Amino acid sequence: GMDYQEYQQFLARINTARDACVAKDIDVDLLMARHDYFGRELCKSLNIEYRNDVPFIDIILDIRPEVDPLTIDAPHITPDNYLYINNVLYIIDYKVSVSNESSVITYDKYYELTRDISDRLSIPIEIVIIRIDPVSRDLHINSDRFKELYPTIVVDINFNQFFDLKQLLYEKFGDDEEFLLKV
Amino acid sequence: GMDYQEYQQFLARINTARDACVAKDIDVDLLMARHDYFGRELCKSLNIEYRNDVPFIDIILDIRPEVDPLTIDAPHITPDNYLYINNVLYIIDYKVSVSNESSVITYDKYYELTRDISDRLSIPIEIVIIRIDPVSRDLHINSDRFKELYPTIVVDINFNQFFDLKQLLYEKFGDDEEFLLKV
Amino acid sequence: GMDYQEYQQFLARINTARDACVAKDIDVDLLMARHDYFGRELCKSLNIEYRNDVPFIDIILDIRPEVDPLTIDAPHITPDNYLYINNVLYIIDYKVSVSNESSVITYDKYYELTRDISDRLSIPIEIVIIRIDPVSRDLHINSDRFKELYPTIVVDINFNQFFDLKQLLYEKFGDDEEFLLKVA
Amino acid sequence: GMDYQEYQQFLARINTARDACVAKDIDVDLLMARHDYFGRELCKSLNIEYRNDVPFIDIILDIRPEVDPLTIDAPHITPDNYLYINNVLYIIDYKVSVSNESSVITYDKYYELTRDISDRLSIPIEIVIIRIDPVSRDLHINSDRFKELYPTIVVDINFNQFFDLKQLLYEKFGDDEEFLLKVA
Amino acid sequence: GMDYQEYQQFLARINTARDACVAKDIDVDLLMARHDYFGRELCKSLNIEYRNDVPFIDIILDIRPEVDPLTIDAPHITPDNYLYINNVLYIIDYKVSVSNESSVITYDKYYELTRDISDRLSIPIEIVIIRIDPVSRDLHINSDRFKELYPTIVVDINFNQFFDLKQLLYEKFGDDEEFLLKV
Amino acid sequence: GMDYQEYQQFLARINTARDACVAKDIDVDLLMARHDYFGRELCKSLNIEYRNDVPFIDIILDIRPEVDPLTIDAPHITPDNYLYINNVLYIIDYKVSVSNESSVITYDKYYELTRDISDRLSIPIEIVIIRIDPVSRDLHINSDRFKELYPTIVVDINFNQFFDLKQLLYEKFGDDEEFLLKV
Amino acid sequence: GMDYQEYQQFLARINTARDACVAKDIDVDLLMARHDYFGRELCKSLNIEYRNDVPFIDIILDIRPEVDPLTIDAPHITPDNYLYINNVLYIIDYKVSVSNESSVITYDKYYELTRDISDRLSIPIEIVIIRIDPVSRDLHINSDRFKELYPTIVVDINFNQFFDLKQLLYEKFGDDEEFLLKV
Amino acid sequence: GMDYQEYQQFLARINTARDACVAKDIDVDLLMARHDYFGRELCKSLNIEYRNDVPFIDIILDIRPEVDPLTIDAPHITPDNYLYINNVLYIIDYKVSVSNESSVITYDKYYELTRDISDRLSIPIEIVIIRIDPVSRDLHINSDRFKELYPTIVVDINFNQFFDLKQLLYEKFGDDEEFLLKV
Ligand SMILES: O=C(O)C(=O)CC(=O)c1ccccc1
Ligand SMILES: O=C(O)C(=O)CC(=O)c1ccccc1
Ligand SMILES: O=C(O)C(=O)CC(=O)c1ccccc1
Ligand SMILES: O=C(O)C(=O)CC(=O)c1ccccc1
Ligand SMILES: O=C(O)C(=O)CC(=O)c1ccccc1
Ligand SMILES: O=C(O)C(=O)CC(=O)c1ccccc1
Ligand SMILES: O=C(O)C(=O)CC(=O)c1ccccc1
Ligand SMILES: O=C(O)C(=O)CC(=O)c1ccccc1
Ligand SMILES: [Mn+2]
Ligand SMILES: [Mn+2]
Ligand SMILES: [Mn+2]
Ligand SMILES: [Mn+2]
Ligand SMILES: [Mn+2]
Ligand SMILES: [Mn+2]
Ligand SMILES: [Mn+2]
Ligand SMILES: [Mn+2]
Ligand SMILES: [Mn+2]
Ligand SMILES: [Mn+2]
Ligand SMILES: [Mn+2]
Ligand SMILES: [Mn+2]
Ligand SMILES: [Mn+2]
Ligand SMILES: [Mn+2]
Ligand SMILES: [Mn+2]
Ligand SMILES: [Mn+2]
């Protein structure tokens, strides 16, 4: 599952935390660690290099190395990862959620901001949101085209440790009104 | 659990659906049915009459029946329920979610919009967001004052049937891009 | 349809117009006259008194004459007409359009702005957009409750005069870019 | 008009639809098919190659093949078609509508977004909105310059299939409030 | 013409001013004094009490003294003046300008903000912008209805002193870039 | 200067703090405690009842008790204090600052939002922002009308403890970027 | 004065007009004709080629003809004219108005939008708004630098014919409410 | 501390001033002169070339002179200063303030607007806000990377003259409401 160091460090933060604002930072850090764990494991299953928040401009420079980085009109986005295969650019973002809400938002943004550069480079740019539902552990991938390339992806993992750390956090701060409504 | 008839109605809808948009509608309707199921069971545990989206003006008329409804300067919000006890008005919203995000949004809006009416009536107005985490089944209530009013509140239920209906929906529409990215 | 004198007024204006801005005001007046024509005929069919743009506050004073208009918290809208029967207030707006866009705008505005006053008065307020598609001439009415009151509505009319005058206007101003791209 | 198989696809969808959201997507697909049908026929009449939604950058690369598409400062629009003759770039958009509203929106956007690139290239860029009113079937074209090139444009078509299918849809969904008040 | 005190005081300010920001304040004060001079002279010709920036609420209380000032929903506008005759409320604003721009803005605002209260009181509210062109000295009045009541208004005045003071200001500060573009 | 028990609490908080977010809350609480200290001392000098954040509606009911709090159209603002003397309502806010910026923002808001209720009650409402510069200890009051009532105000007080507590805080967290740039 | 043919064209338009909107169009067109007449006469006095609304990119190409017009990052403004002298670019707009309002608006926009291009080209860009007051006939130029470049600039003209055309318009439409309040 | 000639000029300005608007300009100029004084002294301590408001584009051309200033996509910002050392670009702004508010606003803006140009040049860009608290004279710098380069910075300076000039100003204009509430 998750790294046993990372686990023990979360446990230490929970145990030493006394203030709602510190607790909320742990809550938020748990969610980002969970997303990143999924990303690393997903990339092992797809057999691709693990990346995080890649500047779009670096993606263009990798796929069309003729491009001049000083001038090219690249959108200001940092997707989790990408794959360029058979002259199709797949732009990948990882998500861990019980809902498709965050996926639709990322999708609409990435799709909209990549149209112009797709037309300039004459390269189709496919936006691929790869989401795992943390309760069912099912994978949901919007892109039919990406799924033809990878028709059977198995990411055999679970989120039980994140669940347990979160329950420990709420065990300790569950009657602090500031924590319960902290952004 | 949920009424057996509500269940079978959802099954028939899922079985007869063929389009992404109908499927997303079912998905949204399962979430509202789940919220309302939690509401009914919560209300039994609080020993209050089950209500849903009560016009604020009707609240005022119940608690101060001499008020002229044509003329009172009052907010236009529709909370799930309320409780008026010892001259304190508790405004209640039910939530089912694994995070606090929707709770903070409703709390901020309800709190901000009831300050003035609270001064005019000379009635303290406490905003009580009652959330159940559908995975852990833990109950989180922001308001210390409400929690002091009650003995330990236990709502011992699960959402397994909603989970199962959702899995059927995804077994049938899980490879439909329009569904996976539908709002 | 519209009476001869109205038709001839439009014919005269179209004949004398030489400028895009004048032509556009004619375009807009024709759509207005079409709407009001439908309204008159619709009301004959429903056997209700014809009205246009009634201030909401007058509606409330008609149905609840004891309300004080100086003090009531009530919305500022002016729907085409209304019907108060069996303690239900139906707020009616007429539309003539091949599309539902204008209906949705009016519906959302009126629905949203009447919720609070519905609660204050304890009178359900039903928003009824009665639209006629002027090509097909089918009537489209959103309100099921209203249609239970009036399940058989026939309005046997036509808009040929309005179509003919608009077609004549766009012909006369067909090489006037300013007119062709002018907004209301 | 549209070919049998297209007509029958719409008939099938309308027949199987039971939900407002499905019905609305049909409404919208019918308007799209009507637009594309006009576009195809219009282009036969003008004797130009039929196109739909051409990226502006491809237009520039067709007319000025030495431009570098990675570096040019150029707008991101996708007009229906274009014509480059006598060193004038005509940017064409097709419209089918009884109103000029949609034309004015497209016109203003394209005009405004193409001024700078017109200056950069030293090529006048003429925005041509070709609209057909589907009731009257008159053609309305804003551009005088374009009309000097094509003073005699005849597109002898009709939209009866589209009207009939829409009328059938609104009949089937005529007591569905959600459909009647649903937006695109 | 303008009061000879007021004149001499403007002249003193011009003569003592050394900074662009003080000068601009004189410019602005000249224009408001000119407007007010016109207002006073206009009111002599119409034979009505001179008023300036009347709270709308005071207007309602004068024409319908039954109204309760604590509750009535009065628009937040302060027109220069008003006349209530034959159950018509004329809301008057003075303008001195070579253009109708400021008139259209005031008209659109006053017209829009007075519709609801017109309907509540059942009193037509006519908005009357009375403008004098300071160069031709012609009077322009939008309201046909107001002009039937006052078919021949003569305001026999001129603005030569304001013109002269302004030219003196520009004589002194005409090469100060800060003054010339000061708001 | 400040209450000794209050000082001790602050010292303890600073000593036990280990996190930027906790430290920033101390920084904020120090600023509000300084504002409130100034307020108490100011109200002693002026011989007025000490208040803090009074809802406008309560001000109205105090000065005009015949008003119906359920119907009156009144602004929703919460100034620090007020003084009603000779049928003039002075609305008071305390400020502690080296700049007039916060004063202007409070002034502009209170002034604008009290014009209508001034008209409705026929009571002049004067906005009085009373600022002490915590370095020079000079008192600055915008309102000449208020200063005619109170021509010599001496609040002979000291903010050295607030300065010292703040310096302790900045010596523990002075190398924490999260703290230095915390909002 | 203005070309005799332009004059007679305006007369015919005024004589054949019957609608408020046509009349306002004439009014707007008289103002633009007046601006452009001032422009032509100003340019003769400055000894520069008459121009109107010059694309900024054409300016850059004239002054730096090696610049690649496809690629230069430049603002999209359309000033009335310009003068490039001793490596200083003077951006010129003509104004006819009795106040500075329209001048401040154009100056702020032109100044803000040319800062970046000025840095990139390494060319100072001075924004020169040249306004004639149509009543006093005085000439006001904001820019000291431009005024230092030139001998005293005299543009000795009047706008009497525009005044007379405007009076004819108002003799015919002065009692038409739609005209008086038309934008 | 500050240049003696500069001091004298300020004293003269304060003595000859009679108007709120002129006084407020002095107040502003005093604050900018204090900021610039701090800047000069700071740059002496750090042994860096004193600069003020450098356009970003000039920074780029200094550090990477092969870039084409006409084509490079670069932010339009004007930080106070910079340091390019070991292929790391430190963007510096000087602040004089008792609060971190202005620092956070400058930081957030510079950070956000330099991310893309960092990617394009492959040069890390660190945002360095250097604030001196004018009361405590303590120096606060957000950037740990910058402080690793410069572990001991002593700017041993004094703002007493600025404080004294400000007090003179507030003793001449302390009873002028227009001044006290001037922006
Ligand atoms: O949620 C995701 O799936 C992300 O990929 C998030 C991400 O990059 C991010 C960016 C800025 C702040 C926090 C998360
Ligand atoms: O999410 C909840 O907890 C609600 O209580 C939702 C609800 O009432 C609602 C109904 C219609 C529109 C928006 C919210
Ligand atoms: O379109 C309709 O159906 C109307 O009923 C329109 C109407 O009353 C109106 C009149 C003037 C301005 C805005 C709307
Ligand atoms: O309406 C038209 O005339 C279009 O040409 C529309 C069109 O291309 C389009 C397609 C998808 C989204 C927005 C516009
Ligand atoms: O221009 C007019 O005609 C006015 O009537 C103006 C007016 O009341 C006013 C209000 C606030 C500030 C300055 C002028
Ligand atoms: O700054 C002041 O002078 C205040 O009087 C502030 C105040 O009331 C307040 C209100 C809400 C939150 C925190 C402070
Ligand atoms: O007023 C001026 O001085 C102009 O120079 C105006 C002008 O060019 C213009 C043209 C079209 C739209 C907006 C302004
Ligand atoms: O406040 C600072 O720290 C500045 O560095 C400010 C600055 O550059 C500036 C820019 C424009 C106008 C006035 C000051
Ligand atoms: Mn990411
Ligand atoms: Mn992600
Ligand atoms: Mn609810
Ligand atoms: Mn709820
Ligand atoms: Mn109407
Ligand atoms: Mn209508
Ligand atoms: Mn298209
Ligand atoms: Mn099209
Ligand atoms: Mn006024
Ligand atoms: Mn006025
Ligand atoms: Mn306060
Ligand atoms: Mn305060
Ligand atoms: Mn121009
Ligand atoms: Mn100009
Ligand atoms: Mn600076
Ligand atoms: Mn600085």
Residue numbers in the entry:
A (entry chain C), B (entry chain B), E (entry chain C), F (entry chain D), G (entry chain B), H (entry chain D): 0 to 182
C (entry chain A), D (entry chain A): 0 to 183
Sentences from the paper on this structure:
Bunyaviruses are a large family of segmented RNA viruses which, like influenza virus, use a cap-snatching mechanism for transcription whereby short capped primers derived by endonucleolytic cleavage of host mRNAs are used by the viral RNA-dependent RNA polymerase (L-protein) to transcribe viral mRNAs. Here we structurally and functionally characterize a similar endonuclease in La Crosse orthobunyavirus (LACV) L-protein. We expressed N-terminal fragments of the LACV L-protein and found that residues 1-180 have metal binding and divalent cation dependent nuclease activity analogous to that of influenza virus endonuclease.
A second structure, at 2.3 Å resolution (R-factor/R-free = 0.177/0.216), was obtained after soaking the crystals with the diketo acid inhibitor 2,4-dioxo-4-phenylbutanoic acid (DPBA). This is a member of the family of 4-substituted 2,4-dioxobutanoic acids which are known inhibitors of influenza virus endonuclease. The two ions are separated by 3.8 Å and have overlapping octahedral co-ordination. The inhibitor DPBA binds tightly to the two metal ions in the active site with three of its oxygen atoms replacing three water molecules in the two metal ion co-ordination. The phenyl group of the inhibitor is less well-defined in the electron density indicative of some residual rotational flexibility. This is indicative of the fact that no direct interactions are made between the DPBA and residues of the protein. In the case of LC183, Asp52, one of the acidic ligands of cation site 2, is on a flexible loop.
